[PDB]
Design a protein around this ligand. Structure first.
Ligand SMILES: CNc1nc2c(CCNC[C@H]3CC[C@H](C#Cc4ccc(-c5ccccc5)cc4)CC3)c3nc(N)[nH]c(=O)c3cc2[nH]1
Ligand SMILES: CNc1nc2c(CCNC[C@H]3CC[C@H](C#Cc4ccc(-c5ccccc5)cc4)CC3)c3nc(N)[nH]c(=O)c3cc2[nH]1
Ligand SMILES: [Zn+2]
Ligand SMILES: [Zn+2]
Lengths: 337, 337
């Protein structure tokens, strides 16, 4: 395969389905990228602290460390961290790119500033302006490392808060630098779904149509369906894994809190779900394990949620390919809510 | 298969290897019985409290509840609980047998009193005497339930503390009642390995040779090898699963605490071990997951320890079958310590 190639196989409205080809593998889009599926996320911020990026490189890089030979995406670390034009003390475009290089990730994120919400126009603009200068610094640092430039890909991240004119300026800046893909940053920071969708309505068409669009940090199943409706191709969120660790399971009928006493005699599987948990165990038994404090319970729940998310993405891909994504979205919504 | 049949295929010293045939499956001996492998343990005490034995029966019994169709052993619940000749308030021979019937277990334990350590002769004797009367009550209650009598098996439990003459009286009493198998109770209660082995040296030959011998609550890998040397056929212990949840892994070189900083760059697998964890991941990565508080780490550790214990039992069975168990024990010991 090539270093990076994105091809769109089918469309419905603003929605797209296709593939990203990379040296380590093919990623079907729209894609859900679970935390460390066709691609997983590494935790740059944690990893730079323990055991350190250099120690990971000493151990062979993140693929060999975690035994995952497929692509890996890493964030640039600042979201998590959060200050001067140089970067942040507690990281800078150059160091962030270096760390991601040492980790050996396949998709590298530019070092940006995730603007707080709410933000005034002036603050959002100052912030987005710094992020675009850091984006150029990120590009140059990436390009200066041969192994990285030739084997990895770099995504730029749009900022601008909820302001159309700043989103436009940011998209323009990013397209002028040039990236392999374009993330929509600065959302899923407490604005609520209606506002997020409003910003996505005008923001995603500003990005190059022929490159992947990544919505960082999103989200709930209904957030993902709505974002795909608005042209997003890639997603990440810890919700499946946090939820798993807190008693909540995703189902096509909505999320359920399995610890509730209502499940204590429920012999149905958690969800339709083809997952292995759902192949063998009842709500009643997972309820029991979790109430008992057993690790297995937490484990089964997480496995289920991860699999649910991938089944959702597969349903989304198939429905766009078949020209029935609009109907799927409506039916999804009817049942989930 | 028959309700219960124990056959001894090979011997070396006091050590034996063979099989127990039951309706739900064959159990290779010496056997390690992990908590809910050829057989697993259910948690009578927990289950009677949540969701209740009747609720489990309502849900189809423990096999269907936990999705395990192979044999299941349950303890009688008092060990865990801990008072009159009737039983204990907080359970009695009859209620204990009823609960185990509702749970649908294949191997049922008599309701006994696990004598505290240390015990004076008089106290040990009074206690063992009550246990033998409860053993007879257990037998009668078991035999009164047709489905149980015809499909399950009942083991009696020897008491008597560390006193030879009381162990003898107890063995005599149990053999006069008649059981499918004989457990050695009252050990692994703080006496230490030298004292446990001393009691086992005289206590196991007192039991019927042609029935299985179960040492309840044992134990560490070296405890198991020594007990098999002394004629024990079956073991249970939560150590693999507790240990897993606390950072400790069993290896042929002894246990290791994976959280120790010494493992942070160790690319070797946890252990020789054929397990799936050891097939794919390094000490360094499991160290990382556990230090990170990730459930996966705890999970991988537990899976490893369970598999280690079953590999140990397989090595023990093979070596007795091949007439080299004596040598295996010495080599085991050399390396483990
Ligand atoms: C929850 N919402 C949300 N997450 C955002 C993120 C982080 C995306 N997820 C990274 C992942 C989290 C789990 C651990 C490993 C790393 C943003 N990141 C970056 N770099 N920039 C952003 O604007 C940004 C915005 C975001 N909004
Ligand atoms: C740790 N040592 C030890 N465990 C003993 C036990 C309990 C055996 N394990 C039962 C198991 C524990 C985990 C949960 C599910 C049920 C004894 N039991 C019974 N019934 N009688 C005993 O004498 C006895 C003695 C024992 N000594
Ligand atoms: Zn499922
Ligand atoms: Zn292993």
């Amino acid at each position: 395969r090539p270093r990076f190639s994105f091809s769109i196989a089918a469309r419905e409205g603003k929605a797209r389905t296709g593939t990203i080809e990379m040296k380590r593998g093919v990623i079907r889009t729209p894609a859900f990228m679970p935390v460390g599926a066709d691609i997983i996320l590494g935790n740059t911020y944690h990893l730079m602290l323990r055991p350190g990026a250099e120690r990971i490189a000493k151990l062979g890089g993140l693929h060999s460390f975690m035994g995952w030979d497929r692509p890996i995406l890493t964030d640039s670390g600042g979201y998590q961290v959060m200050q001067s034009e140089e970067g942040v003390t507690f990281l800078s475009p150059e160091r962030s790119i270096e760390i991601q290089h040492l980790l050996g990730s396949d998709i590298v994120m530019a070092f940006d500033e995730c603007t707080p919400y709410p933000a005034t126009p002036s603050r959002a603009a100052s912030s987005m302006e710094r992020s675009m200068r850091w984006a150029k610094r990120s590009r140059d640092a990436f390009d200066s490392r041969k192994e990285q430039a030739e084997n990895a890909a770099l995504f730029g991240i749009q900022q601008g808060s909820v302001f159309e004119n700043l989103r436009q300026q940011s998209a323009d800046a990013l397209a002028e630098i040039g990236f392999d893909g374009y993330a929509v940053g600065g959302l899923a920071v407490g604005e609520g779904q209606d506002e997020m969708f409003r910003v996505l309505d005008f923001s995603v068409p500003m990005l190059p149509d022929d490159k992947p669009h990544y919505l960082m940090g999103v989200g709930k199943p209904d957030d993902i369906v709505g974002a795909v409706e608005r042209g997003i191709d890639m997603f990440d969120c810890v919700l499946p894994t946090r939820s798993g660790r807190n008693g909540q399971a995703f189902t096509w009928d909505g999320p359920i809190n399995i610890r509730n006493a209502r499940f204590s005699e429920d012999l149905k599987p958690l969800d339709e779900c083809h997952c292995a948990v759902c192949q063998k165990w009842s709500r009643a038994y997972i309820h029991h394990l979790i109430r008992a404090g057993e690790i297995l319970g937490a484990m089964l729940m997480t496995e289920h949620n991860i699999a649910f998310y991938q089944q959702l993405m597969q349903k989304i891909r198939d429905s766009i390919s078949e020209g029935r994504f609009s109907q799927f979205a409506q039916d999804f919504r009817a049942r989930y809510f």
